[PDB]
Write a protein that binds this ligand. Sequence first.
Ligand SMILES: Nc1nc2[nH]cnc2c(=O)[nH]1
Ligand SMILES: Nc1nc2[nH]cnc2c(=O)[nH]1
Ligand SMILES: Nc1nc2[nH]cnc2c(=O)[nH]1
Ligand SMILES: Nc1nc2[nH]cnc2c(=O)[nH]1
Ligand SMILES: Nc1nc2[nH]cnc2c(=O)[nH]1
Ligand SMILES: Nc1nc2[nH]cnc2c(=O)[nH]1
Lengths: 243, 243, 243, 243, 243, 243
Amino acid sequence: QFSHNPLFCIDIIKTYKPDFTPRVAFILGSGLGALADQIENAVAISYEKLPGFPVSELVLGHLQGVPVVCMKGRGHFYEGRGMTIMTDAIRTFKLLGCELLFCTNAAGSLRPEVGAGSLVALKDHINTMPGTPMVGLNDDRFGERFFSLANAYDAEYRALLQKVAKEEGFPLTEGVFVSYPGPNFETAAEIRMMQIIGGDVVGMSVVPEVISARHCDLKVVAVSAITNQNFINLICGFLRKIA
Amino acid sequence: QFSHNPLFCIDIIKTYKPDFTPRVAFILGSGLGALADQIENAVAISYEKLPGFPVSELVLGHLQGVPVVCMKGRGHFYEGRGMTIMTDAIRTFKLLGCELLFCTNAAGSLRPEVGAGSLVALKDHINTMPGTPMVGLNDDRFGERFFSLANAYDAEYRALLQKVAKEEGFPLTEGVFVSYPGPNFETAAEIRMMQIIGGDVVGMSVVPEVISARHCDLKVVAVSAITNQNFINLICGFLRKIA
Amino acid sequence: QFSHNPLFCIDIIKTYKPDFTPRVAFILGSGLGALADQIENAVAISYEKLPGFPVSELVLGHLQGVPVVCMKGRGHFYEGRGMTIMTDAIRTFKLLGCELLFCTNAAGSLRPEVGAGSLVALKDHINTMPGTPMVGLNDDRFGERFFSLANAYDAEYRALLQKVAKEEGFPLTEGVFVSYPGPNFETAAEIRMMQIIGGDVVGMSVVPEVISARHCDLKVVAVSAITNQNFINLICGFLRKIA
Amino acid sequence: QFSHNPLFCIDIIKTYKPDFTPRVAFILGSGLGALADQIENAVAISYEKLPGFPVSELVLGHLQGVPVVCMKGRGHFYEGRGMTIMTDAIRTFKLLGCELLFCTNAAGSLRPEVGAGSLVALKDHINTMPGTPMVGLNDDRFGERFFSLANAYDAEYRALLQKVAKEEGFPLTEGVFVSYPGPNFETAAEIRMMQIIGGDVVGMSVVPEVISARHCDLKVVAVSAITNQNFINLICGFLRKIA
Amino acid sequence: QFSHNPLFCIDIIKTYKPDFTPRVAFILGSGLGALADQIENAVAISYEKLPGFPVSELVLGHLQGVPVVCMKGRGHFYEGRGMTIMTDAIRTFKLLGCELLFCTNAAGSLRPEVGAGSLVALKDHINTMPGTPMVGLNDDRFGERFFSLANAYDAEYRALLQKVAKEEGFPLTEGVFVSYPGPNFETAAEIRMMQIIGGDVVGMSVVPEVISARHCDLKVVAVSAITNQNFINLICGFLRKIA
Amino acid sequence: QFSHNPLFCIDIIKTYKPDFTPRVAFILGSGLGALADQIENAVAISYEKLPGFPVSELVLGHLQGVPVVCMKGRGHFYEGRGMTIMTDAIRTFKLLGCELLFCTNAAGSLRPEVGAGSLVALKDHINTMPGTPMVGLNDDRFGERFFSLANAYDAEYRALLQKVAKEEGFPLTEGVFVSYPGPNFETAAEIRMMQIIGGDVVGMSVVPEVISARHCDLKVVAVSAITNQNFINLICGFLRKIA
Ligand SMILES: Nc1nc2[nH]cnc2c(=O)[nH]1
Ligand SMILES: Nc1nc2[nH]cnc2c(=O)[nH]1
Ligand SMILES: Nc1nc2[nH]cnc2c(=O)[nH]1
Ligand SMILES: Nc1nc2[nH]cnc2c(=O)[nH]1
Ligand SMILES: Nc1nc2[nH]cnc2c(=O)[nH]1
Ligand SMILES: Nc1nc2[nH]cnc2c(=O)[nH]1
């Protein structure tokens, strides 16, 4: 027996935003909400009206003239509902017709050279959380039993990201993201461990969403804001080039 | 309260294959079933008639004149029933009187030098799946609370494996297996991480079975078929030398 | 809904040891019980009378004239009740008024230079067990949603530990502890992995207790007895310097 | 934590049947489906698209020119999901704006004088199923902790039912319904017991729906078809008089 | 595995009310709290500090110079925690050393002759709630697997109750109590059913407490206040005669 | 997902008692074990080796030259595993090929005229336990969703029972059995209620087994030993007449 939540959400969303087919889905991490404020004809639906959504709202509309859907707030593994916490919502994005997920998140740097305030485009990841989202019976309605994470962080969209960054005057390093369960922060040794292992950025999310997206064949693009304006411009510039 | 499934299986098996004491237990991974076709006086019992067995069949008989039991199909961690999924079945092998488990599995190589089509004898492992099979109350009927994994992959049988490989004309490299939860495949970074960590082969099984076997003092021998005739000969030749 | 066990324990303990405010809390690992025998006016309460305590006793009294509470026996992740197994007990120490937790444990060395019989002061840790103690809804009564593990193993108390060791004639090396789920022991490859990762000591506990302690702002001090008199003197000398 | 299913259903229903405020809600028992075939501008929604609905469809439209909602199929206690199986659906009727529930069901007679083919208007009930629908935390959003079942089977609507029956030429006896868990049928002694107790009709449903309805202040009208055209006319005539 | 809550409560209670051995335990139903206000040297403990107690307080002290323990508030079957909801608390009364339970409760009359305002001494009961408190593994520490309810409502104490009632000028009828699950009130037919069955009073509690009391050999006395000063005098007079 | 326990038991039983097709299945209540001692070529299997069987043994063999299976010990509702506790075992009897279940049990009389020591043939029953065995998804492999209890206590076999009783010189009264959950015994009022309701005998079992038997079309015969040699003769005489 599988979840029908995405299907329910499709119908509930038609009620608040009819005849709307979004192309890009966004997940706005921590302090990144202020962007959704600029959505054209913005319609907000509380996650409490969308079954399966990570109750702590979702905003539908246009940005740079592109039909977009946004998630103001995400779910994390540390909340206690396992690695499947972001799966229904991602499946909802796929069923809505989106062609790509634009994930954003607050994170720590594992490189001295990249400090607080920097933005990092994620090119791959190392999962350290226990297990994975698709563990359990496979939902054939969304994807196959086994699946590849090769090019999970779409190389093509990443190249566009690089161009936009040029285009506006800020670095945009590319890195390997390594997930951490939390909610406690990482010990210094764990951090050294992560460097040795090959990581560049460390955080408590992303991996669940991304693996879930790949399973249902939704393309991914992810950018971390290193916490220890540029982001808005990067996003709006990316939107402009894909319009 | 503990599982009595192995005990039940012993009695159920006497009904289909009386007065039979197998010496070697096999787990035939993915495309490796065709071997069981060559078992002498083969009797097949569906896993649905054996409590505790990983319902997706078990074949009892003789091979190279050696009393053998053989699992066509195994259980994995990614199925959602935790790390204990292969434990009852291994305990059943021990109670049947087997003296060694011959585990086989499909896997990926972490060494460029060993490619698709190669066979690798596992000499050790690195567990990356969350937790382990014996976590929880200890079943004193099968083994002790704590136990060593030293020489888990029996050095002696491994040496025989090396001889047989000579004996038939194919390389038989030895490696460290590192388990991965799945069901998604590994990211490239995860793969690099595994190299750095010391691994040679990567897969989604083995570890549960092997740790379970060691706990009840069942000797182990494991060979991976790198997927990204020789196997049959290796197995039959090993059987011949232990007869 | 949260656990009230620590609160219950406070009242139950007043009954056996009234008007007593301990300053240091101890966790005596495996063969380390004989120390509790030297507690002044020792009162022993079975863990079976203390809700939340890891039923396999707790001893309250004075040592070197310092009000102390001691756990003879701890809980481990391998027992099957998850990473929260030591949390209620640590919260009980905090509510009793302790200002520091003195954790002890049996462990293996990852350095050739430090062998069986050595004592190692833990200066940091690398968690390898699945998830962490605070995963799930946060208990605001004890600590915050997020928290830092910086200086988790108090540098100050560690310096005192160094002095005492001088003071009595034995080495006291400092190391990074890396937790392992167990109950099986580590494979040799896993051990190599741990070296590469940066570890110095390996064990099956500590991490749960320590993270739990930090969450409720209880200072920590941890010493491992490498298993593959000095300990008593170190503890008693530390007590003397903090009196 | 309470169910939000009724709320979800409201939004899902707006999508298939916008600007529609039904006044009467029907539950069509066993062989009573053929009535829904006569609904004007009938829109059918499968219970699989309505969270909380007893998956074995719901039909919205007009009948005798009255805005109506109809459940083709109900849930029973014997299915194993307890006495709350019909609660979400009834709450959905209340939230849709219905002013009365018209429950129908197949049943057995406890009076010799009323035989197979007869119709009986239920005037009260005796619950024999274990417990009741509202057992557990009270959902203040729908009703109060305690509530009266006085006049549960609305006397007023029952009088209208009596008139219509005159009006078309068939008896319409009034009786006390006594619920039975099932799924087995009643023993003869149980049946005698029910007579002695004061019952007139016996069945395996009704009680859950009715108690749930009363809790959220939804008026009720119930008619049993004794199994061991008139019904259609009675319903259509009742509708005509309340239009 | 059994509940140790009563044992915990014993120790927690020693802390707030040391060297106190109560003889009578009271359960004050609905509007009956005002009595506890007259307890001598009253000590109140919130049910939130007593594990196993029906969180919606407990008062210990003397009344008519008799050591007494009171429960201001009880647990009911309709709350959703089954028929064992009052068991731990009753066991706590037994372990405290009480020799009798004085249960009180608000109830409805099944006899026209006994109306609102009347008091009825319960002489027996008919359980209509699903199952019973002792269903499941038997706790040998408190009572036997099977036990008799003969004279459950102690005839001797009931006779004293009759004398006191004379003694103060009010009727005191004796009746059979029949429990009802609730939380809804009874239908009129259910009420007729109860009359036919032999009942005199109807309510939503009592039975759980009483059966639990009998299992651990605690004597019982129960009085219902029919809701559809005398009570205080009856209680105080009973206390006086047993002092 | 359904239970396969009966199927497992079939195979396990072939191992201890091959080529054996029993015709009558017995359930020996309390003090009734001594009968199984007289089974010809008796083979005993502990319920611990038969999945689904009510662990507190099963005896297979011949009696009066009739192939028989016999349960020494049954499961009851009061044990806490619900009304399905005897279902797997009864299904096992059906699959073994039995044509009738001969249930026996210890019970109380509701008639003054029938006292301790009497035997009563059950002709019908009144279920007072919460719910019934078949509640939940129906196992089509054994029976239908709905089923009749008419002639549940086979009239034909009952007539034979009457003859045998003549034949040996003892009364054999026929009665209506009414089940009671227990484990406490019935109150006197409950007993009066049972009389009024139409019962003749009262007990804590039978109903689960019997309803389960009827569902899978197994004929039933039940005899209660009123507790508040003749039985052996009745059974052996019945066997003789059906041989
Ligand atoms: N895990 C983790 N999450 C973060 N979010 C922001 N900074 C950090 C950090 O250093 N670690
Ligand atoms: N985890 C894992 N399992 C495999 N089975 C076959 N190939 C692979 C691989 O690359 N990775
Ligand atoms: N995990 C682990 N725990 C230990 N406790 C004592 N020695 C060891 C060891 O080598 N490994
Ligand atoms: N319980 C029950 N339900 C029915 N539905 C139709 N007839 C009957 C009957 O006799 N009993
Ligand atoms: N069940 C029930 N409880 C009550 N408490 C007070 N009055 C009543 C009544 O009529 N019925
Ligand atoms: N329920 C019940 N079971 C019994 N078993 C033997 N006697 C009795 C009795 O009086 N009541």
